[PDB]
Amino acid sequence: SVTANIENVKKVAHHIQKLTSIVPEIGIICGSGLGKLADGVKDKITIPYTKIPNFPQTSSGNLIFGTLSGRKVVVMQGRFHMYEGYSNDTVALPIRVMKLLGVKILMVSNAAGGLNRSLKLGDFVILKDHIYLPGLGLNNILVGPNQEAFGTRFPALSNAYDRDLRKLAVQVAEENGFGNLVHQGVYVMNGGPCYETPAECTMLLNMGCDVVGMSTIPEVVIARHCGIQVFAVSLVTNISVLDVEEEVLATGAQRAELMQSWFEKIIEKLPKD
Amino acid sequence: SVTANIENVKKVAHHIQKLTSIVPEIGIICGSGLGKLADGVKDKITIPYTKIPNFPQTSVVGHSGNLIFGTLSGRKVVVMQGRFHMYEGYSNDTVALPIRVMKLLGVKILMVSNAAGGLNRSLKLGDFVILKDHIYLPGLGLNNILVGPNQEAFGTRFPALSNAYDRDLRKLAVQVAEENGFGNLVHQGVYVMNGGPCYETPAECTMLLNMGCDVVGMSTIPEVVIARHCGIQVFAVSLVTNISVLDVESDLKPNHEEVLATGAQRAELMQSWFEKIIEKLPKD
Amino acid sequence: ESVTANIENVKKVAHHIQKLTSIVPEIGIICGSGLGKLADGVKDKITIPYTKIPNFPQTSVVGHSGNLIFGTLSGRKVVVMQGRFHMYEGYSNDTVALPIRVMKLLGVKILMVSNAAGGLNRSLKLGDFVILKDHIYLPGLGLNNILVGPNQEAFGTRFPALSNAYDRDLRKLAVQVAEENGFGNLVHQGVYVMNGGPCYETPAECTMLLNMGCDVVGMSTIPEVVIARHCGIQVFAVSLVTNISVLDVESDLKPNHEEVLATGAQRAELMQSWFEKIIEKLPKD
Ligand SMILES: Nc1ncnc2[nH]cnc12
């Protein structure tokens, strides 16, 4: 792992800038099986991680540059999860690279378990807040010397999930007839990689959590630290079992396609400087 | 220290298999109250940890733990006399390795005891709490024993913990206690792990109780996670060695000495119980 | 890195300090929020930069090395830590623990600490004082307890109890002193929960912690307290409410570190007077 300090992050950024002339305004991270939720990318340039010195490596991932709905984007195909053993610096670096490349808004998707009992398989839950269990317990991604070039020692997490972006996302869903699928709620991070027990799920639900997953929050924290606005959404891929105690099942990719359309239509309506 | 991967785990298993002809069907981790069970193994072969190359080392004030092979109630067992607590600073791999070795040796069922504080107000000192579920506080906060590359040889990347405390074993254990006249001491409950090694404050105990926890301890969940990961069935019991203090204006404070005493006074009954459970475990 | 807080290393540090001063501290003080002035109040003193103590941990206050200050306060001998060690900075357990263990070897019997905290309890007002009567050590419950590792038997037992961690007699005295000196209305007692940090708590996190029965939240203190209790040092700790936690995600109010600092500095003279007046009333031989 290389330290995600300004000098290391600049070297990686400068290197990418030799490989593409596209200056992204929007960063997109697609979650576990949510790829292509960003690949109507027009006039694209594809940069494999292996091509970028000091950029983290997947256990084949790509950085994809291009235009979506008239706007310049960079899409991370392949994310870094704390349960895999990646360091704080490894996970922070891509987001800080995004900042140096010009990203102003980060759009994140993930798959999550539905804790809230009103949730259905296939629902979208826009994150309006989070509970960073690892961070409260001394594994916050910002532990260590503060990189001052990027942000302040004690970032506030007020309006972490930009309310104006959430409003827009909801309006876009409604306008395109899938508003009934969209909720807003609190995402809690389980460091993982075990799925949550019923007692764990009950505790988390009672803590005020709506969905649970193993990712996203660390990226959000780094984004907010360096002043990137954040939009994040969970796809509810399963309903959490709350108490201890064999059919033909379809597992299609329609929701993935829907989410892709959703992100494209949001980007279409984002403000542009 | 030594990675709990297939190569290293097989090397250890093979060393052990050179030292005994006993192929264990049941593994037992001796925690609080199981001291006499360990010493009552029939036709036992004792293998000190120090004698097993690459097997993690742990001592009780200097004396190495042992693997003990033999029979209990006519079934082949391996008993771990000497466990590995995370509060001692042992690595994820060090704690996982013995369990994965048990898997390769042939273990199908893991039985474990521990000492716990009683949060649930109905519990009495010396009660037995069969774990029916757990809350793995270190695991939720990025100190899960499986963090790191998954060892595919042993199990899947994201293990489900749905029926982690096998419902059939729990049923049997209750039945045996009931049949033998001590059903009144047996409960089932949710165990929450405190990394430790501090005892819980009253504010911590109040929070844990209100989270839905019945007992709190500093061990066991990591082993259970590794066991479930590699498909070993689990039976675990907490011995209530302290009644959790929930009021800060109290002068009663937990001490490991009385914890040891409770373990000592209940060891005979717990041994009887485990022996009688093992006798009735399915498939013999 | 780095230096183990075991008896050998702690003895070396203490013996070095003892070559610099003959003052035998009975009270140790960790300057947190509101105690910025305390160093200046200590009389007949010697100031020892951390940089001048071999194998002592290093940290900066303002733009200079932290200091260990020895002298007299309210007629009692004290050692003051000017510059503290926060886990969110990346310091090790041994680093945080060593100074407390050094205090023990120097003769310290009582540790007084202040810190800045967010007010979760809804009856709290900005600038209030919340004496800690108990805590919830989230990092500790989640396997980041400062004592994780081999137990150092010279200092304490493997499984410390945290009963009466916040000495009830010191808490009683502190309340009495505030009452007598006309600021009893600023003083509460409560449960402190540690957020590892360095992020301020989200509204959802604040709501969770409040419902867990926490009154204030901060990023320090508990690890030092655990080390003090382990080695038998009596503890008095107070949170200055430097921000009122935002529980509502649709609120425009937010914690601001400049304001946190201002709130702490504003209360500093009163906090210091309070500590000085508690020390004056402590029993002594
Ligand atoms: N229920 C769940 N818990 C944690 N991570 C998840 N990812 C998808 N579903 C999940």
UniProtKB/TrEMBL annotation, chain B:
Phosphate binds at S32, H63, R83, F84, H85, A115, S219. Adenosine binds at Y199, E200, M218, N242, H256. InterPro entries: Nucleoside_phosphorylase_d, Nucleoside_phosphorylase_sf, Pur_Nuc_Pase_Ino/Guo-sp, Purine_phosphorylase. Hypoxanthine binds at A115, N242. A purine D-ribonucleoside binds at E200, N242. It comes from the Eukaryota. Its EC number is 2.4.2.1. GO terms for biological process: nucleoside metabolic process. The purine nucleoside phosphorylases catalyze the phosphorolytic breakdown of the N-glycosidic bond in the beta-(deoxy)ribonucleoside molecules, with the formation of the corresponding free purine bases and pentose-1-phosphate. This is Purine nucleoside phosphorylase. The lineage of its organism: Eukaryota, Metazoa, Spiralia, Lophotrochozoa, Platyhelminthes.
From TrEMBL, chain C:
Pathway: Purine metabolism; purine nucleoside salvage. Residues 26-279 form the Nucleoside phosphorylase domain. GO terms for molecular function: guanosine phosphorylase activity; purine-nucleoside phosphorylase activity. The keyword Transferase applies. Keywords: Glycosyltransferase, Transferase. GO terms for cellular component: cytoplasm. Signal peptide: none annotated. It is an enzyme of class 2 (transferase). It catalyses: guanosine + phosphate = alpha-D-ribose 1-phosphate + guanine; 2'-deoxyguanosine + phosphate = 2-deoxy-alpha-D-ribose 1-phosphate + guanine; inosine + phosphate = alpha-D-ribose 1-phosphate + hypoxanthine; 2'-deoxyinosine + phosphate = 2-deoxy-alpha-D-ribose 1-phosphate + hypoxanthine. Its EC number is 2.4.2.1. It comes from the Eukaryota. One of its GO terms (biological process) is nucleoside metabolic process. Hypoxanthine binds at A116, N243. The purine nucleoside phosphorylases catalyze the phosphorolytic breakdown of the N-glycosidic bond in the beta-(deoxy)ribonucleoside molecules, with the formation of the corresponding free purine bases and pentose-1-phosphate. This is Purine nucleoside phosphorylase.
